[PDB]
Design an enzyme around this catalytic site. Structure first.
Site, mmCIF file in Angstrom:
data_model
loop_
_atom_site.group_PDB
_atom_site.id
_atom_site.type_symbol
_atom_site.label_atom_id
_atom_site.label_comp_id
_atom_site.label_asym_id
_atom_site.label_seq_id
_atom_site.Cartn_x
_atom_site.Cartn_y
_atom_site.Cartn_z
ATOM 1 C CG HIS A 100 19.501 31.688 139.457
ATOM 2 N ND1 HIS A 100 20.383 30.989 138.662
ATOM 3 C CD2 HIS A 100 20.047 32.915 139.634
ATOM 4 C CE1 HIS A 100 21.419 31.757 138.373
ATOM 5 N NE2 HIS A 100 21.241 32.932 138.952
ATOM 6 N N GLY A 159 26.155 39.372 138.344
ATOM 7 C CA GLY A 159 25.404 39.904 137.223
ATOM 8 C C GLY A 159 25.774 39.235 135.910
ATOM 9 C CB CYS A 198 23.658 34.650 136.253
ATOM 10 S SG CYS A 198 24.534 34.254 137.772
#
Lengths: 306, 305
Positions: free
Chosen positions: B41, B143, B145
């Site tokens: 993503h 942030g 991820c």
């Protein structure tokens, strides 16, 4: 979201751990540039620890009395000296993994990460707070002496603790990196005991703020309190007296949540008097005091759920 | 000597963390040899999450669409592909710090250390367990991820988790390093939510053995119980059903202490039904369920890496 007792990444410190042996005693050392720091009692024999005179015991040693090892490789010591309760061994080569660093002496109530080591090798990392009585409730086994505590700001490592011993109650004592003990403890076998301890009020309050930031406010109330009135209650529960300075420190957290410090103190007062009634805060059933206001701000969102 | 929930030294993993940027989206990536792994993503936007077609979206991307940064250095991307919910970026430089490693899919109840990272920079490390409901109670901010979870065996790093999202209750969901999600969650905007969770019985038992090994044994008794009778009680307190396999996994601890697992279950039954009466076990007022039988041996023995 979420809230954990997290430690600083330990890599920068792992790259500085070595093994130091003298006679039959081996422990951990901290290798920075061309120097290795370690607990001076590495030179003590069984009988020595009962009533050792380090000046007398050290003068009987030479540079080759010390065997320093980085992994399985020996580091030649070309000099040595004692600084308070630490030995400073100069070696013939520098540690290329030496991070930007500084030596700092922390104050009780502050937190730091500990990299538990054995024979110069890392075992694990955990976060803890120095208790008001200067001891730490760590997890150390025989041979963990020399392991260090630290904090990291950007890429600069601030070393603040070196492990030296375990007290009767199972708690631990150590020194800063200048070799000065935290607390009245000494490095010899005696009737030492941890002093009385208190709960770190400032941290519990910081933790309650973390809970609010994370969306929970079940423990708040419509009351407020005087600093003095709060202390009259809190001190009854073995809590460290709260000062105006502590209140001021909670300013940022107060501003982010819209909850006045004294109002949060009112909430804490109620929690101490009535208990939590089977409920939890950030998943805990007890009031946590191992998170400083700085820790909370660093780990929590800059924006409160609401 | 104390008992602390500790994490594995994170150095070996810190050396593999990088920043991956795609347009306005920035997250973390895992750099091993000449490949950088990150959540797919990263090719999305705020609106792109509410209904993605990663297949189509990736096509509009080319190598230069991805900016990989390791420290103050730019890693030139020379290839890219998607593997399940992951993006695999081939870079022109093999990570000099690549440790011995393997990719593993962890099982419910098992623990691992998480290295929280932001902009490719590690910020902290903590221990956690994969909950029976397939989520982890982590601590992540926007942030994070791409942050990974792992375990270490001697000198080999076993990566088992990569962070992808946060659920409505504030818990977290992610994938193994093959990009397959743990649980039924998807990297998309839906009404997905964590199911009910249970206490990890296997771990609570492991922790009671740890307590015994450390001299805290006041809760032991001279009775035993059948597995079925234990589960009838345990399940009333929302504990995971104990299986014969769990009993066997506790074998080493049982052998070390000379306390049969079912005898320990009898102890636990009494603890659940009568509480601790103000006592503590390893300094705790509650029964900890985030220490596996393996974590216990690891910490009680002096295992180093």
């Amino acid at each position: 979201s979420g809230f954990r007792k997290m430690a600083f990444p330990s890599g920068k410190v792992e790259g500085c751990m070595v093994q130091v042996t003298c006679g039959t005693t081996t422990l951990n050392g901290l290798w920075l540039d061309d120097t290795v720091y370690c607990p001076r009692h590495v030179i003590c024999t069984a009988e020595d620890m009962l009533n050792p005179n380090y000046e007398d015991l050290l003068i009987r040693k030479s540079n080759h009395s010390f065997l320093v090892q980085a992994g399985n490789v020996q580091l030649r010591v070309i000099g040595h000296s004692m600084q308070n309760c630490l030995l400073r061994l100069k070696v013939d080569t520098s540690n290329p993994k030496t991070p930007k660093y500084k030596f700092v002496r922390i104050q009780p109530g502050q937190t730091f990460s500990v990299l538990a080591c054995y024979n110069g090798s890392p075992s694990g990392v955990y976060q803890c707070a120095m208790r008001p009585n200067h001891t730490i409730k760590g997890s150390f086994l025989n041979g963990s002496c020399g392991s260090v505590g630290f904090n990291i700001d950007y890429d600069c490592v601030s070393f603040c603790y070196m492990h030296h011993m375990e007290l009767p109650t199972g708690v631990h004592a150590g020194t800063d990196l200048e070799g000065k003990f935290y607390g009245p403890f000494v490095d010899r076998q005696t009737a030492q005991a941890a002093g009385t301890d208190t709960t770190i009020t400032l941290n519990v309050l910081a933790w309650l703020y973390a809970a609010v930031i994370n969306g929970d406010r079940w423990f708040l109330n419509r009351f407020t309190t005087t600093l003095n009135d709060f202390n009259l209650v809190a001190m009854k529960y073995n809590y460290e007296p709260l000062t105006q300075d502590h209140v001021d420190i909670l300013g940022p957290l107060s501003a982010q949540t819209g909850i006045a410090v004294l109002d949060m103190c009112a909430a804490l007062k109620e929690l101490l008097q009535n208990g939590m009634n089977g409920r939890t805060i950030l998943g805990s059933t007890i009031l946590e005091d191992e998170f400083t206001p700085f820790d909370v701000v660093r780990q929590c969102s800059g924006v409160t759920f609401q």
